[PDB]
Amino acid sequence: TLFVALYDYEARTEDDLSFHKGEKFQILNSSEGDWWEARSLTTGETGYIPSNYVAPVD
CB of 53 closer than 8 Å to CB of 36: no
**Segment interacting with Na ion, rule: CB under 5 A, options 9-17, 18-26, 35-43, 47-55:** 47-55
Give the type of residue at 21: K
Interface mask toward Na ion for 1-40; x: CB under 5 A: ----------------------------------------
Q: Find the shortest distance in angstroms from Cβ 34 to Na ion.
A: 9
Neighbours of 22 (CB within 10 A): 11
Q: Find the shortest distance in angstroms from Cβ 55 to Na ion.
A: 5
Q: What are phi and psi of 53, to 5 degrees?
A: -95, 0
Binding site for Na ion (CB under 5 A): 51, 54
